[PDB]
Amino acid sequence: MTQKTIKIGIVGLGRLGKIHATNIATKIQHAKLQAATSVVPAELDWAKKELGVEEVFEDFDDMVQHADIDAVFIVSPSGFHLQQIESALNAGKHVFSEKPIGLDIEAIEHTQQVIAQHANLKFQLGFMRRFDDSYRYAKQLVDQGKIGDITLIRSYSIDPAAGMASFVSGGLFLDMSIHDIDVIRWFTGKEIDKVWAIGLNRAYPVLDKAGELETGAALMQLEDKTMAILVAGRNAAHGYHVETEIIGTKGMLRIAQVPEKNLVTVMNEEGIIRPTSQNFPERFAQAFLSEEQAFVNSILNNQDVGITAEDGLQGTKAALALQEAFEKNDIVQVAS
Template sequence: MTARANDEPIRLAAVGVGRIGKFHARHVQEVAAADETCLLTAVVDRHADTAKRVAAELSAGQAHEILAFDSPEALAAAGVAEAAVVASRTADHRRDTQALVESGLRVLLEKPLADTLKEAKELGAWLEAEPGRNQSVMLAFQRRYDEPLLRAKALLDAGRIGTLFKIVSILEDPEPPPPGYQSSGLLTDMGVHNADEVLWLSGRSPTAVLGMGGGLYNQKIDGVVVEDFDDAFVQLWLGEDVVAQIQVSRNHVAGYRNETTLYGTEGLIHVGHFDDDPLKVWLEAYGKEHVVIEKQAFPTRNYERPVPVFIRRFGPAYKAEVAAFVACCAAAKPFAVTHQDGLRAMAVVAAAAAALRTVGQAQPL
């Protein structure tokens, strides 16, 4: 980690410019416009035509041209970036990260850390093998930068609901992933967000897991991206006195649903409602006898055009995450969320996936 010379902006590339990568690139440009700590110089995509098209779109209105490359290796050889935001297919996370880190770039890597727990462990071991590498990767768990969830954590840590004993974390998509999307399985692709949230909010590590999964709705539709399950409930013990439930689904047809509930000995904190206004995220905290500790709505960002549901919910968090990454790169500081957090969450979802039971494996009634 070397600090930037002469206050020159950190030169960044966006690697993988599909659904989410394009937004990361835009957010880099917005951070650059606001404080000049960074500059988006390049985009990379294995689909060379996509790289060229997105580079041209992102160059519009900029003082410089955004370059297009078809591999992380070509980007590294050109020497036009000190850091990169990687949102390539999950199956490419490990090789893209290794190629970039090998060339001295710091990387903001989309979740999950890798396609399988085995690959994630191998990537983790490779990053740990040399002192220069082990601070190269920031894991993009955007919930850690989400204002409503940060407020919930602050209330929890301040003891406002007493001692935490239960967490329920729900993430439900309104539809299956788009055609061509590469999923590592329902829990690794979606539940990894909830797993990290539970670890982060509780400060605990799970000690036992069980759960049930089903192919209830979208997996029965012809032509849908094939996944192991489209709905799952996972229960975790975090020691003997704290439990958590993770609920993930591709079948919440009424719209995108994110809710987190923290149960304490003195009250409850709840983040997220499902209602008719997706541009507001509610946080409510109650003490005993329904006493309101805090109740407020956090506006999300209105991009004023159709955007993927996760962007509509977490837009400001994705941008804050990019800003935190740039700030650490500019100051040559360690990242607060690293590959180790990615690995811990992967270990939880891998154990959960192995523990899931289907109807044929359950106790018959």
């Protein structure tokens, strides 16, 4: 009977890897988590015991050469994405890769070429916000012309204070802002021209010498003089604050003005309380499932999803520009 099962091998079983692994194994239609790769033995025992993964590997190339798989999910550290993407494509496997695509512009361009040489194989980057129901609803309003042309986008990505102690990386803007950059490109269809970024380690000055930032902000000018504002942070007291505001000529919208946990309002001595989502797995649970299913369906239906290596390239380049602008404390042109 038509359209069978896509067998997937995963690499990277950190927090996010385990979410994708668990989802593929137990929720995603027409998919099997067949293989897993990790350099941490305990992670491979987990894959076998919890998810019943049949083939475990210590090495990614070993998995892609030998495992009974049609596709891979790449959830390794960012420095490994490009080489693993190329290897999987060269072994005839469809590829889902987490963001960022890579860290080095030249290396990324090498991978773009490899991808272009395997056009029959699916390649999808994990910009999961494109699959989130609220982002999609806003995108629809924008596409329908309901707020007119976009004049400004403000996007915030602030991690919960709960993560600061362990955090004390590639930089604040690469870590926190790449989804925001992609959202800006997605909604506008436009590119970013120049940026200025500033930052502070006011709560945790230890990050000064570690090179890092606890909170940063940026102003960006787009190609048609569209404006964008970013805030990125690692120290939100109220939970996981990911919010995107779009201002248009005819209206305005905000996606998660505040990060409401659910439909429950609590009233007590502190006033009126809306509990908040606390972390990315909670906030983006639906989006992760949707992007995984889209990847599997793309293979079965031979239809591209629309999230390209170019989207990856531009994401990384803008983030590098923000980083450079922060270090120089000056305006930087992205194309340079």
